[PDB]
Amino acid sequence: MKIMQVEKTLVSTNRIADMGHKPLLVVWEKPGAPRQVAVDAIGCIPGDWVLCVGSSAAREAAGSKSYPSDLTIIGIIDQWN
Amino acid sequence: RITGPGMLATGLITGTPEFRKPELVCAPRSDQMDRVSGEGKERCHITGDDWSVNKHITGTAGQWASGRNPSMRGNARVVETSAFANRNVPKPEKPGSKITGSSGNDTQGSLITYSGGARG
Amino acid sequence: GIALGMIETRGLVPAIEAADAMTKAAEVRLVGRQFVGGGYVTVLVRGETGAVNAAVRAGADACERVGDGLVAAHIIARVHSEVENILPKAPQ
Amino acid sequence: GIALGMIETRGLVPAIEAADAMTKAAEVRLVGRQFVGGGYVTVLVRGETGAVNAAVRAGADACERVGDGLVAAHIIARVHSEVENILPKAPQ
Amino acid sequence: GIALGMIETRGLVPAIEAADAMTKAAEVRLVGRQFVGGGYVTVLVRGETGAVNAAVRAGADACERVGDGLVAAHIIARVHSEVENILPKAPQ
Amino acid sequence: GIALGMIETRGLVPAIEAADAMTKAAEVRLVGRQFVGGGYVTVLVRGETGAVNAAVRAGADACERVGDGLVAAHIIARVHSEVENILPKAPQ
Amino acid sequence: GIALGMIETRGLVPAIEAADAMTKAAEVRLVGRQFVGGGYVTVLVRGETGAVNAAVRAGADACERVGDGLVAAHIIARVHSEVENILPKAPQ
Amino acid sequence: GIALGMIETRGLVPAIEAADAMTKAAEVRLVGRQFVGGGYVTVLVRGETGAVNAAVRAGADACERVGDGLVAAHIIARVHSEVENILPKAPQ
Amino acid sequence: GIALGMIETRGLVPAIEAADAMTKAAEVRLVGRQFVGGGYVTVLVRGETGAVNAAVRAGADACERVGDGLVAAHIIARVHSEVENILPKAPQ
Amino acid sequence: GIALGMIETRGLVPAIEAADAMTKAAEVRLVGRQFVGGGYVTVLVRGETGAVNAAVRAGADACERVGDGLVAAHIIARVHSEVENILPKAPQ
Amino acid sequence: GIALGMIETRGLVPAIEAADAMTKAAEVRLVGRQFVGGGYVTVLVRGETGAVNAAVRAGADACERVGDGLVAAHIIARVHSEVENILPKAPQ
Amino acid sequence: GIALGMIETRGLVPAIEAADAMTKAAEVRLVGRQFVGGGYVTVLVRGETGAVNAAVRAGADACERVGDGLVAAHIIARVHSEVENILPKAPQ
Amino acid sequence: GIALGMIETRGLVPAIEAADAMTKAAEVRLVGRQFVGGGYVTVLVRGETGAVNAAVRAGADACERVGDGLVAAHIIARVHSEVENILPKAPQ
Amino acid sequence: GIALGMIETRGLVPAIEAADAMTKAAEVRLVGRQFVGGGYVTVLVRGETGAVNAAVRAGADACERVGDGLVAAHIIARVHSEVENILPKAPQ
């Protein structure tokens, strides 16, 4: 599992229908680092230091075994530098 | 015989005088709902010099509080018009979309409606 | 006139239709529209006793089946001076 | 007067009929008409004990048939001093 | 525009949908929305008789399947002068 | 004292009856009444923890049958300083 | 910011959950929280049709099983100028 | 402290019990109490995620048996900036 | 008054008896006697709504057993302005 | 204002009731009250097609039971230019 | 007030309860308590005739099921001057 | 020290046993012992409502099967200020 | 008159029949005829919404029995400006 | 924008209804109405993905029950530069 920071919300209107209505956020390891998109299971405000899961584990955290997710936020860090 | 406004409403008008040692100290939570819910609850059996009152003791709360003031209870027609009461209202056929292409056309989610009631 | 005529309905659409029928029917004046709460809306009309009887009957017959429906249609020929304190004088 | 008479009804039409019936029956004073919300309207009359008993009886008899009807008709011969703070003094 | 068309709904989302469908369907003016209480919301439009009928029919269809639903749809081609005192002149 | 007693009723008539019973049947002081909405009308009392307990039992017995009746009855012997903000200091 | 998205719910807890999900899902501004009455609480958001489409969709799943539940979830891509008069401008 | 803890209940008495349990159980501050309408009463607390977790769980248990009961017990770990405009800043 | 009472009869003798009976019964000013043709004669009066109800009842009784008898008795509590053009003003 | 609506009745009393109800319902100008002969009275009105349909419905319902009764209720949305030479334009 | 209301009971405990009930119930003043002898305790009140009737009714009901019970409940609407000698004037 | 708890007994030996058990069970003064006459001895205690309830309950248990026995166990959490006169201030 | 009414038919003969009946039925100005292809012919008439509704209803009935038949009948009270580019502007 | 929204229908009346619904339901510009032959007509709109999603969904619903019905309703969010050659630039 990885520790990332939410920067901004990402909107993809024509996304595949298998994604449901789960919102998407743009998370990066550190400011200026590569940006990735994570399905948001536990709601995160921008700037939150979130904890994200990857691989097949992501699909379950997205609310269904068949969900098409590679990165899924599963928790918000209470206190992170 | 004589038509007019006086013939319109029949029987819908009113007020017209027109002429002519149990195993557990605290009883099961399901068993009873306390009359006084918090800090007065008697579901837990507190032995000793509690403030509980037997039948021998007569006074304060009881017949003596209830019968002080005369009261008349009428059987009103009571229908609740609230959000919860409307939770089971008859609803029309749920909207369905024949849309194709990549539009995030998800029907597993909560009913999202667009202008005119179209699902989406 | 001072005779009071009241029509109570479930919702505002029945109330406005009732008020239209009452004022159209007889020489009554719309003096108030009360939101009792819980979806009860009352319309009060003042006029002479003959006029109010016609006005109220028209209002009950007009809104009987409009929308949620009609709750009550009453006529008081003379209201006690005490009750005047709780009756609206003009509608807003 | 010190006695309090209250008649709660479902709607404002039965309440106005109940408030007219009270003040017409005996020497009572319509001290308040409160919209409890949820579609209940309460009318409170204040007067001497004998008058309040008569007023509330007339009110109850009058509103049992008008509109949704009568929820409660109650008399308190003398109200506690603390409770007087939660009672109206003028008809609102 | 002197004719009145009213749509009553259970909730505010159907009301705004009705107001949007009603106004975009025919040449009418949304003169007001009222929170009747008890979860009823009335949206009113003033226009010509032909325009109003088209609007209300568009409004009823739009808000029928949105939210808890549609309660009442009503058209008054001629509104008495008095009734206009209990109708919003312009939207809030 | 510091103990807080509450009785919740549907309508105002049972609440006034409850409030009368509480203040008459123990050394409590009626701090206020709240119109919660949808019918519910709450009456709050403050007093010693023993007196308030006898006051809320008497109140429940008194209003149990008046009008629509009683919904809830409570005592909170100590009230957190945070909750003190949302409790009416005195009947307004 | 001319696309309107509304979510109606029974109670306030679902409304705040829906509002939080709607505003964390896309770049939508929360312009209103209207207590319709009878329990219904509606949250209105404004933004680009794409952002509001995603916001409302995310919010609906968030509040579907929070409290009593969800009543409506409506998106209007192009709202008539007339309807803007009844829409709120700021959340307060 | 940014986490939000809201509990919705049918009546004020269950809410006041929830407010007492929530603030006594953890280090949370009561920010507001709201009368949604139709009976629901929501109490909101702001604190750290851990404290709000313990408070809401403690509150939801305390008020389950009180009066009509619990409608919703919801914890938001972090509230979006937009939603802060629709939340009370300090108790009424 | 502006209420209109009309009595239609077969032949003129019943009409004259009706007009005489109506004017004597209540405060109704005779306004016209129109020969409809085919045996129909109509007598129209104006007055307060209460007076017209009494006058029309008397006129209907008076002409019921005279000659070919009565055909129509009708009361209009309020007549639109446009219809004034087709009403006699004074008998000729 | 071209659409023509005609109501034919047996006698003048049902015709005047039809004219009043027809004119009250919507914006239609009363153009003629023609005594056909043999007891037939015809009231013609003119206005927009939407208003005329509403007006004639009200007249047919209002005059159906008054007197001998209603004969015909007819609407022509547009009359041929030739026919207008046989249509009254002002009532006498 | 000049009306006397007496309640007699078998033993002091019912009498004290009767006295409390009477004073709390209506607007009466507790003049005194008498020890007749043989186990009879008589308690007297003074007030207007309608207040004493309400008080004595409350006192009789309250003390009927306490101890040995109620012996006598009597109301004298007016007391002759001579009788005033044998009545306690102020309680011990 | 406002609550009043009275125990009445047939004789003095039960009263002493009751007065002994009452004063031992809770913090309550033995304000009075009265010889009502006819073989009735009433013992009164004054204390807190919680203390008095415990005292009277204990006293009734100890004296029920002593001598002729228990006549009445009564508790009044707050006696009317008027009744305070007819009570005994001290047992001597 | 800006409302748009359209009738679609299989074969030109019903289309010509529909246009004759639509124009003659009410005051709608024929605006075009379009060979859709595959046997579908559409005729579009503009005019007032009320008149356009009457015309289309008349045209549908008259053209239904003729030829292959009626496919569609439509009215749009306010056609959006973008669609006005594709509609015929006048018959050629 | 560059997104494309296409509705194909059996006839022209359904296509016009869809085009009306699309353009008034979102911010999309109608770019063509192409007769494909065999009765198929295709209305094409261009705009941003969010607006096109809303429009086509509104268009698909509006024309489903109009005439022969709806054939296809497709949304291409980004269109290849190659396809732009065949897609109509502006309506004819």
mmCIF file with all atom_site columns, N, CA, C and O in Angstrom, chain B residues 40-69:
data_model
loop_
_atom_site.group_PDB
_atom_site.id
_atom_site.type_symbol
_atom_site.label_atom_id
_atom_site.label_alt_id
_atom_site.label_comp_id
_atom_site.label_asym_id
_atom_site.label_entity_id
_atom_site.label_seq_id
_atom_site.pdbx_PDB_ins_code
_atom_site.Cartn_x
_atom_site.Cartn_y
_atom_site.Cartn_z
_atom_site.occupancy
_atom_site.B_iso_or_equiv
_atom_site.pdbx_formal_charge
_atom_site.auth_seq_id
_atom_site.auth_comp_id
_atom_site.auth_asym_id
_atom_site.auth_atom_id
_atom_site.pdbx_PDB_model_num
ATOM 1   N N  . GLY B 1 40 ? -33.354 7.206  34.966 1.00 0.00 ? 40 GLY B N  1
ATOM 2   C CA . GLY B 1 40 ? -34.487 6.782  35.798 1.00 0.00 ? 40 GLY B CA 1
ATOM 3   C C  . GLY B 1 40 ? -34.844 5.365  35.448 1.00 0.00 ? 40 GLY B C  1
ATOM 4   O O  . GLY B 1 40 ? -35.599 4.760  36.205 1.00 0.00 ? 40 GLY B O  1
ATOM 5   N N  . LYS B 1 41 ? -34.280 4.835  34.369 1.00 0.00 ? 41 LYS B N  1
ATOM 6   C CA . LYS B 1 41 ? -34.563 3.469  33.888 1.00 0.00 ? 41 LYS B CA 1
ATOM 7   C C  . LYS B 1 41 ? -34.561 2.479  35.043 1.00 0.00 ? 41 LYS B C  1
ATOM 8   O O  . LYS B 1 41 ? -33.647 2.569  35.859 1.00 0.00 ? 41 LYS B O  1
ATOM 9   N N  . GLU B 1 42 ? -35.528 1.560  35.091 1.00 0.00 ? 42 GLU B N  1
ATOM 10  C CA . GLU B 1 42 ? -35.608 0.520  36.103 1.00 0.00 ? 42 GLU B CA 1
ATOM 11  C C  . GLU B 1 42 ? -35.355 -0.868 35.529 1.00 0.00 ? 42 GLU B C  1
ATOM 12  O O  . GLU B 1 42 ? -35.675 -1.866 36.182 1.00 0.00 ? 42 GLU B O  1
ATOM 13  N N  . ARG B 1 43 ? -34.785 -0.956 34.325 1.00 0.00 ? 43 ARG B N  1
ATOM 14  C CA . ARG B 1 43 ? -34.469 -2.260 33.752 1.00 0.00 ? 43 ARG B CA 1
ATOM 15  C C  . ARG B 1 43 ? -33.367 -2.947 34.546 1.00 0.00 ? 43 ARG B C  1
ATOM 16  O O  . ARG B 1 43 ? -33.386 -4.168 34.732 1.00 0.00 ? 43 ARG B O  1
ATOM 17  N N  . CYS B 1 44 ? -32.391 -2.177 35.019 1.00 0.00 ? 44 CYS B N  1
ATOM 18  C CA . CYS B 1 44 ? -31.356 -2.719 35.890 1.00 0.00 ? 44 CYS B CA 1
ATOM 19  C C  . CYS B 1 44 ? -31.858 -2.753 37.327 1.00 0.00 ? 44 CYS B C  1
ATOM 20  O O  . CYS B 1 44 ? -32.443 -1.780 37.814 1.00 0.00 ? 44 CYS B O  1
ATOM 21  N N  . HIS B 1 45 ? -31.632 -3.877 38.001 1.00 0.00 ? 45 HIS B N  1
ATOM 22  C CA . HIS B 1 45 ? -32.134 -4.095 39.355 1.00 0.00 ? 45 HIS B CA 1
ATOM 23  C C  . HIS B 1 45 ? -31.099 -3.574 40.343 1.00 0.00 ? 45 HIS B C  1
ATOM 24  O O  . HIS B 1 45 ? -30.099 -4.239 40.622 1.00 0.00 ? 45 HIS B O  1
ATOM 25  N N  . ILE B 1 46 ? -31.340 -2.382 40.876 1.00 0.00 ? 46 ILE B N  1
ATOM 26  C CA . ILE B 1 46 ? -30.462 -1.778 41.871 1.00 0.00 ? 46 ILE B CA 1
ATOM 27  C C  . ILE B 1 46 ? -31.027 -2.104 43.248 1.00 0.00 ? 46 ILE B C  1
ATOM 28  O O  . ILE B 1 46 ? -32.020 -1.511 43.676 1.00 0.00 ? 46 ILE B O  1
ATOM 29  N N  . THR B 1 47 ? -30.395 -3.041 43.944 1.00 0.00 ? 47 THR B N  1
ATOM 30  C CA . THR B 1 47 ? -30.805 -3.372 45.297 1.00 0.00 ? 47 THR B CA 1
ATOM 31  C C  . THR B 1 47 ? -30.394 -2.257 46.255 1.00 0.00 ? 47 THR B C  1
ATOM 32  O O  . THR B 1 47 ? -29.648 -1.341 45.905 1.00 0.00 ? 47 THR B O  1
ATOM 33  N N  . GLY B 1 48 ? -30.897 -2.342 47.482 1.00 0.00 ? 48 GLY B N  1
ATOM 34  C CA . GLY B 1 48 ? -30.552 -1.370 48.498 1.00 0.00 ? 48 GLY B CA 1
ATOM 35  C C  . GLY B 1 48 ? -31.564 -0.252 48.614 1.00 0.00 ? 48 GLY B C  1
ATOM 36  O O  . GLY B 1 48 ? -32.761 -0.464 48.405 1.00 0.00 ? 48 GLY B O  1
ATOM 37  N N  . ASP B 1 49 ? -31.092 0.949  48.944 1.00 0.00 ? 49 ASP B N  1
ATOM 38  C CA . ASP B 1 49 ? -31.972 2.090  49.189 1.00 0.00 ? 49 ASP B CA 1
ATOM 39  C C  . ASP B 1 49 ? -32.136 2.934  47.924 1.00 0.00 ? 49 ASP B C  1
ATOM 40  O O  . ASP B 1 49 ? -31.847 4.129  47.891 1.00 0.00 ? 49 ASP B O  1
ATOM 41  N N  . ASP B 1 50 ? -32.619 2.287  46.871 1.00 0.00 ? 50 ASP B N  1
ATOM 42  C CA . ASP B 1 50 ? -32.944 3.002  45.651 1.00 0.00 ? 50 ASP B CA 1
ATOM 43  C C  . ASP B 1 50 ? -34.194 3.850  45.861 1.00 0.00 ? 50 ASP B C  1
ATOM 44  O O  . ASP B 1 50 ? -34.877 3.757  46.884 1.00 0.00 ? 50 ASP B O  1
ATOM 45  N N  . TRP B 1 51 ? -34.498 4.687  44.872 1.00 0.00 ? 51 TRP B N  1
ATOM 46  C CA . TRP B 1 51 ? -35.664 5.556  44.932 1.00 0.00 ? 51 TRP B CA 1
ATOM 47  C C  . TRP B 1 51 ? -36.910 4.907  44.343 1.00 0.00 ? 51 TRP B C  1
ATOM 48  O O  . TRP B 1 51 ? -37.912 5.597  44.130 1.00 0.00 ? 51 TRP B O  1
ATOM 49  N N  . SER B 1 52 ? -36.873 3.604  44.079 1.00 0.00 ? 52 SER B N  1
ATOM 50  C CA . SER B 1 52 ? -38.031 2.917  43.530 1.00 0.00 ? 52 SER B CA 1
ATOM 51  C C  . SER B 1 52 ? -39.159 2.864  44.554 1.00 0.00 ? 52 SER B C  1
ATOM 52  O O  . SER B 1 52 ? -38.936 2.950  45.765 1.00 0.00 ? 52 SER B O  1
ATOM 53  N N  . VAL B 1 53 ? -40.382 2.715  44.053 1.00 0.00 ? 53 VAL B N  1
ATOM 54  C CA . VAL B 1 53 ? -41.592 2.785  44.863 1.00 0.00 ? 53 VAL B CA 1
ATOM 55  C C  . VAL B 1 53 ? -42.434 1.545  44.598 1.00 0.00 ? 53 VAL B C  1
ATOM 56  O O  . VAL B 1 53 ? -42.651 1.173  43.441 1.00 0.00 ? 53 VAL B O  1
ATOM 57  N N  . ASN B 1 54 ? -42.911 0.915  45.670 1.00 0.00 ? 54 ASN B N  1
ATOM 58  C CA . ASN B 1 54 ? -43.736 -0.279 45.566 1.00 0.00 ? 54 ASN B CA 1
ATOM 59  C C  . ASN B 1 54 ? -45.185 0.098  45.270 1.00 0.00 ? 54 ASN B C  1
ATOM 60  O O  . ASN B 1 54 ? -45.514 1.250  44.976 1.00 0.00 ? 54 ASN B O  1
ATOM 61  N N  . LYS B 1 55 ? -46.068 -0.902 45.338 1.00 0.00 ? 55 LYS B N  1
ATOM 62  C CA . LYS B 1 55 ? -47.499 -0.627 45.288 1.00 0.00 ? 55 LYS B CA 1
ATOM 63  C C  . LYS B 1 55 ? -48.019 -0.145 46.636 1.00 0.00 ? 55 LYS B C  1
ATOM 64  O O  . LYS B 1 55 ? -48.965 0.649  46.685 1.00 0.00 ? 55 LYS B O  1
ATOM 65  N N  . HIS B 1 56 ? -47.423 -0.617 47.735 1.00 0.00 ? 56 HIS B N  1
ATOM 66  C CA . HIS B 1 56 ? -47.841 -0.158 49.054 1.00 0.00 ? 56 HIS B CA 1
ATOM 67  C C  . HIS B 1 56 ? -47.770 1.360  49.149 1.00 0.00 ? 56 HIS B C  1
ATOM 68  O O  . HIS B 1 56 ? -48.697 2.002  49.654 1.00 0.00 ? 56 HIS B O  1
ATOM 69  N N  . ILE B 1 57 ? -46.680 1.926  48.637 1.00 0.00 ? 57 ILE B N  1
ATOM 70  C CA . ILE B 1 57 ? -46.500 3.398  48.636 1.00 0.00 ? 57 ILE B CA 1
ATOM 71  C C  . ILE B 1 57 ? -47.443 3.947  47.585 1.00 0.00 ? 57 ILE B C  1
ATOM 72  O O  . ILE B 1 57 ? -47.373 3.462  46.458 1.00 0.00 ? 57 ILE B O  1
ATOM 73  N N  . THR B 1 58 ? -48.288 4.904  47.959 1.00 0.00 ? 58 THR B N  1
ATOM 74  C CA . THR B 1 58 ? -49.295 5.533  47.077 1.00 0.00 ? 58 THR B CA 1
ATOM 75  C C  . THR B 1 58 ? -48.995 7.027  47.052 1.00 0.00 ? 58 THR B C  1
ATOM 76  O O  . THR B 1 58 ? -49.021 7.585  48.109 1.00 0.00 ? 58 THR B O  1
ATOM 77  N N  . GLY B 1 59 ? -48.645 7.647  45.928 1.00 0.00 ? 59 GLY B N  1
ATOM 78  C CA . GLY B 1 59 ? -48.474 9.110  45.902 1.00 0.00 ? 59 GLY B CA 1
ATOM 79  C C  . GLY B 1 59 ? -47.549 9.626  44.828 1.00 0.00 ? 59 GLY B C  1
ATOM 80  O O  . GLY B 1 59 ? -46.860 8.799  44.220 1.00 0.00 ? 59 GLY B O  1
ATOM 81  N N  . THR B 1 60 ? -47.492 10.949 44.648 1.00 0.00 ? 60 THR B N  1
ATOM 82  C CA . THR B 1 60 ? -46.656 11.619 43.614 1.00 0.00 ? 60 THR B CA 1
ATOM 83  C C  . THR B 1 60 ? -47.091 11.064 42.257 1.00 0.00 ? 60 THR B C  1
ATOM 84  O O  . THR B 1 60 ? -48.264 11.268 41.918 1.00 0.00 ? 60 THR B O  1
ATOM 85  N N  . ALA B 1 61 ? -46.209 10.432 41.490 1.00 0.00 ? 61 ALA B N  1
ATOM 86  C CA . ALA B 1 61 ? -46.525 9.925  40.141 1.00 0.00 ? 61 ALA B CA 1
ATOM 87  C C  . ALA B 1 61 ? -47.601 8.857  40.223 1.00 0.00 ? 61 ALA B C  1
ATOM 88  O O  . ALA B 1 61 ? -47.491 8.007  41.117 1.00 0.00 ? 61 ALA B O  1
ATOM 89  N N  . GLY B 1 62 ? -48.585 8.886  39.327 1.00 0.00 ? 62 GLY B N  1
ATOM 90  C CA . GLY B 1 62 ? -49.612 7.831  39.274 1.00 0.00 ? 62 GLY B CA 1
ATOM 91  C C  . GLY B 1 62 ? -50.993 8.400  39.115 1.00 0.00 ? 62 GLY B C  1
ATOM 92  O O  . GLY B 1 62 ? -51.111 9.388  38.418 1.00 0.00 ? 62 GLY B O  1
ATOM 93  N N  . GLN B 1 63 ? -52.007 7.731  39.644 1.00 0.00 ? 63 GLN B N  1
ATOM 94  C CA . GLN B 1 63 ? -53.405 8.223  39.653 1.00 0.00 ? 63 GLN B CA 1
ATOM 95  C C  . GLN B 1 63 ? -53.454 9.662  40.142 1.00 0.00 ? 63 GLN B C  1
ATOM 96  O O  . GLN B 1 63 ? -54.365 10.364 39.734 1.00 0.00 ? 63 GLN B O  1
ATOM 97  N N  . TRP B 1 64 ? -52.560 10.069 41.026 1.00 0.00 ? 64 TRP B N  1
ATOM 98  C CA . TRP B 1 64 ? -52.642 11.371 41.679 1.00 0.00 ? 64 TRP B CA 1
ATOM 99  C C  . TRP B 1 64 ? -52.197 12.487 40.745 1.00 0.00 ? 64 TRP B C  1
ATOM 100 O O  . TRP B 1 64 ? -52.655 13.629 40.867 1.00 0.00 ? 64 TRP B O  1
ATOM 101 N N  . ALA B 1 65 ? -51.302 12.181 39.805 1.00 0.00 ? 65 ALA B N  1
ATOM 102 C CA . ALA B 1 65 ? -50.916 13.165 38.801 1.00 0.00 ? 65 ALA B CA 1
ATOM 103 C C  . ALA B 1 65 ? -51.904 13.182 37.641 1.00 0.00 ? 65 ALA B C  1
ATOM 104 O O  . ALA B 1 65 ? -52.213 14.243 37.089 1.00 0.00 ? 65 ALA B O  1
ATOM 105 N N  . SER B 1 66 ? -52.415 12.009 37.259 1.00 0.00 ? 66 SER B N  1
ATOM 106 C CA . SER B 1 66 ? -53.238 11.912 36.058 1.00 0.00 ? 66 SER B CA 1
ATOM 107 C C  . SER B 1 66 ? -54.615 12.535 36.261 1.00 0.00 ? 66 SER B C  1
ATOM 108 O O  . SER B 1 66 ? -55.111 13.252 35.384 1.00 0.00 ? 66 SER B O  1
ATOM 109 N N  . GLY B 1 67 ? -55.247 12.278 37.400 1.00 0.00 ? 67 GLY B N  1
ATOM 110 C CA . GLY B 1 67 ? -56.625 12.658 37.622 1.00 0.00 ? 67 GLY B CA 1
ATOM 111 C C  . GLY B 1 67 ? -56.847 14.058 38.148 1.00 0.00 ? 67 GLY B C  1
ATOM 112 O O  . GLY B 1 67 ? -57.964 14.370 38.576 1.00 0.00 ? 67 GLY B O  1
ATOM 113 N N  . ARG B 1 68 ? -55.828 14.917 38.132 1.00 0.00 ? 68 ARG B N  1
ATOM 114 C CA . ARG B 1 68 ? -55.995 16.254 38.692 1.00 0.00 ? 68 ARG B CA 1
ATOM 115 C C  . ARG B 1 68 ? -56.787 17.161 37.756 1.00 0.00 ? 68 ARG B C  1
ATOM 116 O O  . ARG B 1 68 ? -57.580 17.990 38.216 1.00 0.00 ? 68 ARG B O  1
ATOM 117 N N  . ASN B 1 69 ? -56.589 17.025 36.446 1.00 0.00 ? 69 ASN B N  1
ATOM 118 C CA . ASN B 1 69 ? -57.173 17.930 35.470 1.00 0.00 ? 69 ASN B CA 1
ATOM 119 C C  . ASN B 1 69 ? -58.142 17.183 34.561 1.00 0.00 ? 69 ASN B C  1
ATOM 120 O O  . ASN B 1 69 ? -57.788 16.120 34.033 1.00 0.00 ? 69 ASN B O  1
#
